[PDB]
Write an enzyme that holds these catalytic residues in place. Structure first.
Site, PDB file in Angstrom:
ATOM      1  CG  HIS B 351      77.885  -2.265  22.216  1.00  0.00           C
ATOM      2  ND1 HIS B 351      77.413  -1.685  23.369  1.00  0.00           N
ATOM      3  CD2 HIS B 351      77.634  -1.381  21.219  1.00  0.00           C
ATOM      4  CE1 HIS B 351      76.909  -0.497  23.088  1.00  0.00           C
ATOM      5  NE2 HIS B 351      77.038  -0.288  21.789  1.00  0.00           N
ATOM      6  CE  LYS B 542      74.956 -12.576  34.161  1.00  0.00           C
ATOM      7  NZ  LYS B 542      75.664 -11.317  33.836  1.00  0.00           N
ATOM      8  NE  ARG B 543      68.679 -13.731  25.188  1.00  0.00           N
ATOM      9  CZ  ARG B 543      68.347 -13.369  23.950  1.00  0.00           C
ATOM     10  NH1 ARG B 543      67.876 -12.141  23.662  1.00  0.00           N
ATOM     11  NH2 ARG B 543      68.447 -14.263  22.991  1.00  0.00           N
ATOM     12  CE  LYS B 548      75.300 -12.554  28.294  1.00  0.00           C
ATOM     13  NZ  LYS B 548      75.686 -11.256  28.934  1.00  0.00           N
ATOM     14  CB  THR B 650      74.347  -2.922  32.091  1.00  0.00           C
ATOM     15  OG1 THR B 650      73.525  -3.815  31.350  1.00  0.00           O
ATOM     16  CG2 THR B 650      75.211  -2.145  31.161  1.00  0.00           C
ATOM     17  CE  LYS B 654      70.294  -3.489  34.156  1.00  0.00           C
ATOM     18  NZ  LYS B 654      69.592  -4.400  33.278  1.00  0.00           N
TER      19      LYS B 654
HETATM   20  C1  B1K Z   1      70.910  -8.642  17.206  1.00  0.00           C
HETATM   21  O1  B1K Z   1      72.302  -8.910  17.252  1.00  0.00           O
HETATM   22  C2  B1K Z   1      73.027  -8.497  18.344  1.00  0.00           C
HETATM   23  C3  B1K Z   1      72.453  -8.049  19.544  1.00  0.00           C
HETATM   24  C4  B1K Z   1      73.283  -7.648  20.600  1.00  0.00           C
HETATM   25  C5  B1K Z   1      74.682  -7.710  20.499  1.00  0.00           C
HETATM   26  C6  B1K Z   1      75.465  -7.320  21.535  1.00  0.00           C
HETATM   27  N1  B1K Z   1      75.048  -7.100  22.799  1.00  0.00           N
HETATM   28  C7  B1K Z   1      76.146  -6.740  23.477  1.00  0.00           C
HETATM   29  C8  B1K Z   1      76.199  -6.357  24.939  1.00  0.00           C
HETATM   30  O2  B1K Z   1      76.269  -4.932  25.010  1.00  0.00           O
HETATM   31  C9  B1K Z   1      76.180  -4.466  26.366  1.00  0.00           C
HETATM   32  C10 B1K Z   1      76.042  -2.954  26.378  1.00  0.00           C
HETATM   33  O3  B1K Z   1      77.300  -2.376  25.986  1.00  0.00           O
HETATM   34  C11 B1K Z   1      77.425  -4.943  27.197  1.00  0.00           C
HETATM   35  O4  B1K Z   1      77.258  -4.534  28.589  1.00  0.00           O
HETATM   36  C12 B1K Z   1      77.553  -6.434  27.114  1.00  0.00           C
HETATM   37  O5  B1K Z   1      78.817  -6.817  27.722  1.00  0.00           O
HETATM   38  C13 B1K Z   1      77.493  -6.903  25.628  1.00  0.00           C
HETATM   39  O6  B1K Z   1      77.562  -8.335  25.534  1.00  0.00           O
HETATM   40  N2  B1K Z   1      77.206  -6.757  22.663  1.00  0.00           N
HETATM   41  N3  B1K Z   1      76.780  -7.132  21.439  1.00  0.00           N
HETATM   42  C14 B1K Z   1      75.250  -8.156  19.295  1.00  0.00           C
HETATM   43  C15 B1K Z   1      74.417  -8.555  18.237  1.00  0.00           C
HETATM   44  C1  PLP Z   2      70.391  -5.211  32.447  1.00  0.00           C
HETATM   45  C2  PLP Z   2      69.660  -6.271  31.691  1.00  0.00           C
HETATM   46  C3  PLP Z   2      70.410  -7.192  30.836  1.00  0.00           C
HETATM   47  C4  PLP Z   2      71.941  -7.137  30.766  1.00  0.00           C
HETATM   48  O1  PLP Z   2      72.410  -7.981  31.826  1.00  0.00           O
HETATM   49  P1  PLP Z   2      73.952  -8.520  31.735  1.00  0.00           P
HETATM   50  O2  PLP Z   2      74.054  -9.285  33.030  1.00  0.00           O
HETATM   51  O3  PLP Z   2      74.803  -7.286  31.698  1.00  0.00           O
HETATM   52  O4  PLP Z   2      74.031  -9.352  30.508  1.00  0.00           O
HETATM   53  C5  PLP Z   2      69.711  -8.166  30.143  1.00  0.00           C
HETATM   54  N1  PLP Z   2      68.362  -8.251  30.207  1.00  0.00           N
HETATM   55  C6  PLP Z   2      67.595  -7.454  30.960  1.00  0.00           C
HETATM   56  C7  PLP Z   2      66.109  -7.619  30.985  1.00  0.00           C
HETATM   57  C8  PLP Z   2      68.193  -6.386  31.731  1.00  0.00           C
HETATM   58  O5  PLP Z   2      67.455  -5.535  32.485  1.00  0.00           O
END
Ligand code: B1K
Ligand code: PLP
Ligand code: B1K
Ligand code: PLP
Lengths: 810, 810
Positions: B351, B542-543, B548, B650, B654
């Site tokens: 991911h 988003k985070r 980003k 994702t 949405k």
């Molecule tokens: C606790 O440590 C971690 C928590 C999360 C991630 C992580 N998150 C995603 C996100 O995965 C989504 C679902 O595939 C992608 O849509 C998104 O682009 C990606 O950043 N990629 N990697 C990595 C380390």
């Molecule tokens: C869908 C969703 C995300 C992922 O959003 P991205 O724009 O793809 O990073 C993060 N947080 C919440 C609460 C969501 O519903």
């Protein structure tokens, strides 16, 4: 099957079966193909619980509408045991549930055995609180029990190589169906901080906050549709607590540790900060709850007319300065008015005179943890001593003796002195004990305020301790005199007219025999041991403590063993000597006593010359559910504390009600039991309190008894030389050294009288008809020892409320 | 009221009302006179839960009988959000519950707002797992989600003085009605210890044991009566753990800390021991559960025919050596056979390509915690590199690059390399991302085993993300094309025939307007802020992360502000710019970005010349329940990551489904969205991946952009000189210094194209009919982005199982 278990009507049984199946499906999410016995237990518990809820809601509604005086019973311990059977007994559902489960292909007695004891107490003090809640509900009092919901109760005891090992009592692992969390009535409790003096009063600031979350458990009365509440507090950290990030979240455990574990000491004071936190936690949360309820009925003059607070020993004694704090600092009452309200509201029950059990908190602990409370305590003390000085002018030593503050290397607060000063009533727990309080440790206080001092002899509930644990005995009694005795135990006196009745004599002896058979089989199944059920069952079950003198019992057991070995072909009445109880984890001598008992067993039980004439069994993990099994099976009850040490005892009463004879000293409630039954129907031996005092004046010299009693010398030589520990010959030297040189409880001084009295027991047991007649005389006169009697006396003489046997509508 | 919410029949509504009242009385122990809104929520939740249980039992029974191949989805994160409404949607109960509660005098929407989010994830990865569970149930797959039941999920965000503060997410405080504890299937997990080599194999001995207790949550499919299970493990100490006495009991927290808290990092690796423990804990418990179920269907050849294990990134990668450990050490399979089974069972989803997100565990940690696993990893590595050396003889640098063991000051294990070696399939999460994996970071692995590498473009569930959050839009679609699209989202293509339909254009615009009004009022009520609902709603949620590029959005906002101030009397399309998201607690730059956004707001929102033409709002505590409110209200979706950094996204999907247009770079799934809708219906700007590579080759010099773009220079001068922080003029110097000298994400390089593209957005918004026509073209082509499509591809191309839309009997 038996009448006292109630009716099993077709409609009732059909509805119980439906609801059992509903809970199995919807509540437990199981079907019959994968359900275990534990799932079946939970399904039944939820089914029975449903019958409580309507009554619980209506009872609490009724108290809101009528606004009676409320009774608050504050305790650090509530030793409840199991709830399922007790609930069924009190709702008259036992036969109906038995029939319902039987028709579903299940054995209800097997399901009952799955339930965990709620083991939130150490022994007698905690179990007294539980009996009291049952009696308060049965007498229609608007009463609330308040305590702490410990995550871990009294430890589970395992015996390994003859030694006690402790395991955590994870009683909540599978859930507790009896409690209802009430996170919505969560309240803050403050710790640490400092006091600021503003122009209008003191302010307690910069405090650390812990939340108190209540869990409510229903307490049903006996067939009166009253259901009272036991409210237990659990500690929660606030969400901003310590708020790198991960460590701050993990550190929430520091706050939540307050409610984690019960201190496992019986009759011993351990002055640890965590215990002090527990004491304040329960008091601070409870008092806020009390005041909230009072304001939802400005005018605190009426507070003592609507509120009684009973302090179960000094453990919740901080209620006194906390009530003063709230009234003075927060409600802005003047000191004198706040004090009047406090004294009229609070009453204190003392449960021990042993000096090592009395709470004396170091000032430095209170200064850091509860700085405002310490200031209030000092002010109470100065005002109290001003009164003493006016009543006894020039008596400077009296001022020192009566002070709440003890001088020394470390200044301490004497919490018993605080409770007496701040309470309108102070009681002991048996007549001899209340007299001892007035003559010795609280003599000065009694001279100042004689009107405060009362007696309230302890009791036990006959619901749990007869109907529940011994239905066979309850039934044969009911066949003669009806069922009213279950809530009016004085009716057992009617049984004296059946002391020469051949059929009644037979039935009493038959019930005992059945109970012994059932217990003998329990032992084989759960613990792989073979006992002779025709032998006399000689039982001593209670916490292990030097003052309770399990060691004296040990000396008798070894005496019998040595007598058999000296004359093996002489007849002796066969005995099974059962001793059980937990030792506090840090109490070395108590742990050594357990090891001695098992080591005696190792020798006695494997000697082929002894045969089945003598067996010594250590009963592992003694607790409320084990008491319910062994007490109905006992022939002889051992109540052998040194005169002046057992404040009351309550085990003693349980055995009396269940058809055992008692061998005992004139200590605690044994005195009153002998008075009720007649001394001729009790096996009394040993020093009275006056004899102990006379020995203490000349000096106890154990060597004199060793030198004069050859049978005693032989036992000590066996202990010392390694007869009971051949691989570790010096194993018992601490026991020998204690007995010979620093025995505070005078074991040797009662040895001769004890052995002679035991010979009289054996003589009577050889005549089963006369043994049983004496038993009937005991059961018949046990009515005074109902906790219903005890609670009616508290109500009338302390709380100022009238008990009621009238039923609420169903 | 609306058709897609189902039928409200008289019988159904009557039965719901009865059961609601039953739960209020029996389950909650309240009457209507003292019940709060929270009690009413719980009563409804239990009522709805009861409808799940029969289906849950029958589904699990059906899998036992049919014995299909089982799919196990292993994840450290499941971001579930609220459950009540989703349950009603999937059981077709929404209108019935609405009517039932309405007749009881209650507003169901108000009750829904009381439920806590289950926030057991950080963002996209966790939420993908949740959408996937919904799709797997809807497609009739015998699927299980396995994870950890964190006591504290993602922290609650508060903004104080413009700064993020974190508070613990105590989501379990009031109870969770959706889970069922299963303490009976508790399993042991081992840590530490050492390895002994006996004559017949290795033995892992002297270990510390923690118990894994499962809690099961139902996962309902969409109107098919399938209810799957999400099983989450919680850590418990054994009862002999550390068994002075009091401290031993308190120290149980050390074991139980494993499941206490979610690590709150998104796309960042923190190599802490506690996190490693969590990873093994979930794997060890899950694998025992899998094997148990497999043996209750010797012959492990059939294991991959009955079991698929999908690894959600490398977080559960220890499944590979754990499966090898069990098969070799415990089941006594030879290595080669065990390896064949493992590879055929496991599949890995990647991911992220960001180097700081990749898990590389220090060898010394694994050596201490999991000594047997380290030995197995070394053996895997040696066997794997032997294969590499045979395929590419003499290519010594390839051996170094491909090793599972990284050399350096600290040796580390590369867990991604482990997953590739031990998996039969490796996939990325959007076409561009899967291509990047083959061309860059996993190029060597792709050359060795090209057949392993796949793409599975991400998706979202249209149940939560259309029907639940935007019923108005769902309804107007259903009026035209029926209801089948909810489980076959490709049917939305039929809407292209309604792009010139005046009534449909009107209705689409009306629904958006209603959603904006409803959100504008939500903002006033909960957060006291006044927004113009006629303005364009420009949303980036988003985070918070440098990749980003919330900072790029900030630069545009300041540009618009400066343009207004330069020509205040010129018309500009009004905007409300909303940015929200959480920053990881230790991520300094992300916290500084939040502060910058609020500081821009402080200036812009109070400038009287701006008026209601521009507002900047920071949306506090962005989470799943807030996404459900703001996404339906958005006009413009900001998806502006540097090309090559967002693996998929994702959120993007949405917004597309809910009638927003997208401004975005050609990154992640944005590429595929533009391809589906047509590039003419998307606002594409900025560098492509190839352009970023070309800049990196010559060297990114941010100074060049500062020197050439006067509007950009003005913004940097304002930031540096304290225009947005007058009391702390140097507050933003770290942001300026980063942008000017070490910006890894090339914010300035996309500034000009971004601002020009935003002007095109504004131009289109002035023509509401053409704006809405473009929206219809987006909604109509969003069908590919259903997670039902994604899951059908995993099923057919990886797991080897056929999806099914057939209903189980009710
Ligand atoms: C606790 O440590 C971690 C928590 C999360 C991630 C992580 N998150 C995603 C996100 O995965 C989504 C679902 O595939 C992608 O849509 C998104 O682009 C990606 O950043 N990629 N990697 C990595 C380390
Ligand atoms: C869908 C969703 C995300 C992922 O959003 P991205 O724009 O793809 O990073 C993060 N947080 C919440 C609460 C969501 O519903
Ligand atoms: C946790 O610390 C403590 C726990 C318990 C006690 C205590 N227990 C009793 C017993 O109280 C019973 C009920 O009144 C009496 O019957 C019994 O005689 C007494 O020892 N007295 N004191 C003291 C400290
Ligand atoms: C009644 C009881 C006690 C008190 O027994 P004493 O002999 O009065 O000390 C202790 N423990 C349990 C489990 C009890 O039921």
């Amino acid at each position: 099957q038996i009448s006292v278990r109630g009716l099993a009507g077709v409609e009732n049984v059909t509805e119980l079966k439906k609801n059992f199946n509903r809970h199995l499906h919807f509540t437990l999410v199981k079907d019959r193909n994968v359900a275990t016995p534990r799932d079946y237990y939970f399904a039944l518990a939820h089914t029975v619980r449903d019958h409580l809820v309507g009554r619980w809601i209506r009872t609490q509604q009724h108290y809101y509408e009528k606004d009676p005086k409320r009774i608050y019973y504050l305790s650090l311990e509530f030793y409840m045991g199991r709830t399922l059977q007790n609930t069924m007994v009190n709702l008259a559902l036992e036969n109906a549930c038995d029939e319902a489960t039987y028709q579903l292909g299940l054995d209800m007695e097997e399901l009952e055995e799955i339930e965990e004891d709620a083991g939130l107490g150490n022994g007698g003090l905690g179990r007294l609180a539980a009996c009291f809640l049952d009696s308060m509900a049965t007498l229609g009092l608007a009463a609330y029990g308040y305590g702490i919901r410990y995550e871990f109760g009294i430890f589970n005891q395992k015996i390994c190589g003859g030694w006690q090992m402790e395991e955590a009592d994870d009683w909540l692992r599978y859930g507790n169906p009896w409690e209802k969390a009430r996170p919505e009535f969560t309240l803050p409790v403050h710790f640490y901080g400092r006091v600021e003096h503003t122009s209008q009063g003191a302010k307690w600031v910069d405090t650390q906050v812990v939340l108190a979350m209540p869990y409510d458990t229903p307490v049903p009365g006996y067939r009166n549709n009253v259901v009272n509440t036991m409210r237990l507090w659990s500690a929660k950290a606030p969400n901003d607590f310590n708020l790198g990030y991960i460590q701050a979240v993990l550190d929430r455990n520091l706050a939540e540790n307050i409610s984690r574990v019960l201190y496992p000491n019986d009759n011993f004071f351990e002055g640890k900060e965590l215990r002090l936190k527990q004491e304040y936690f329960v008091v601070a949360a409870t008092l806020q709850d009390i005041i909230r309820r009072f304001k939802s009925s400005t005018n605190f003059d009426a507070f003592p007319d609507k509120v009684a607070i009973q302090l179960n020993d000094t453990h919740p004694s901080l209620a006194i300065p906390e009530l003063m704090r709230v009234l003075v600092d927060l409600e802005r009452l003047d000191w004198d008015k706040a004090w009047e309200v406090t004294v009229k509201t609070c009453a204190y029950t003392n449960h021990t005179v042993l000096p090592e059990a009395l709470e004396r908190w170091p000032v430095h602990l209170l200064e850091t943890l509860l700085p405002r409370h310490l200031q209030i305590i000092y002010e109470i003390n100065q005002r109290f001593l001003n009164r003493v000085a006016a009543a006894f002018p020039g008596d400077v030593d009296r001022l020192r003796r009566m002070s709440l503050v003890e001088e020394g290397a470390v200044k301490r607060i004497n919490m018993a002195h605080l409770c007496i000063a701040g309470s309108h009533a102070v009681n002991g727990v048996a007549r001899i004990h209340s007299e001892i309080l007035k003559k010795t440790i609280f003599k000065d206080f009694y001279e100042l305020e004689p009107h405060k001092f009362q007696n309230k002899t302890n009791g036990i509930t006959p619901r749990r301790w007869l109907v529940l644990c011994n239905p066979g005995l309850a039934e044969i009694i009911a066949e003669r005199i009806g069922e009213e005795y279950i809530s009016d135990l004085d009716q057992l006196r009617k049984l004296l007219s059946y002391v020469d009745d051949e059929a009644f004599i037979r039935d009493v002896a038959k019930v005992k025999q059945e109970n012994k058979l059932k217990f003998a089989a329990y032992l084989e199944r759960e613990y792989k041991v073979h006992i002779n059920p025709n032998s006399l069952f000689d039982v001593q079950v209670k916490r292990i403590h030097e003052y309770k003198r399990q060691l004296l019992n040990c000396l008798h057991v070894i005496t019998l063993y040595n007598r058999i070995k000296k004359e093996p072909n002489k007849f002796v009445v066969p005995r099974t000597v059962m001793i059980g109880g937990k030792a506090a984890p840090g109490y070395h001598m108590a742990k050594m006593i357990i090891k001695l008992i098992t080591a005696i067993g190792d020798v006695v039980n494997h000697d082929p010359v002894v045969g089945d004439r003598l067996r010594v069994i250590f009963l592992e993990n003694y607790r409320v559910s084990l008491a319910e099994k062994v007490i109905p099976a006992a022939d002889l009850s051992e109540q052998i504390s040194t005169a002046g040490t057992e404040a009351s005892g309550t085990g003693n009463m349980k055995f009396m009600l269940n058809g055992a004879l008692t061998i005992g000293t004139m200590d605690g409630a044994n005195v009153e039991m002998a008075e009720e039954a007649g001394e001729e129907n009790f096996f009394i031996f040993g020093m009275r309190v006056e004899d102990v005092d006379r020995l203490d004046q000349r000096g106890y010299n154990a060597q004199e008894y060793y030198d004069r009693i050859p049978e005693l010398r032989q036992i000590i030589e066996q202990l010392s030389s390694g007869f009971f520990s051949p691989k570790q010959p010096d194993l018992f030297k601490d026991i020998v050294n204690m007995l010979m040189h620093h025995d505070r409880f005078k074991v040797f001084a009662d040895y001769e009288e004890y052995v002679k009295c035991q010979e009289r027991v054996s003589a009577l047991y050889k005549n089963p008809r006369e043994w049983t007649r004496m038993v009937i005389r005991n059961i018949a006169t046990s009515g005074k020892f109902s906790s219903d009697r005890t609670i009616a006396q508290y109500a009338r003489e302390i709380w100022g409320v009238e008990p009621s046997r009238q039923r609420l509508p169903a």
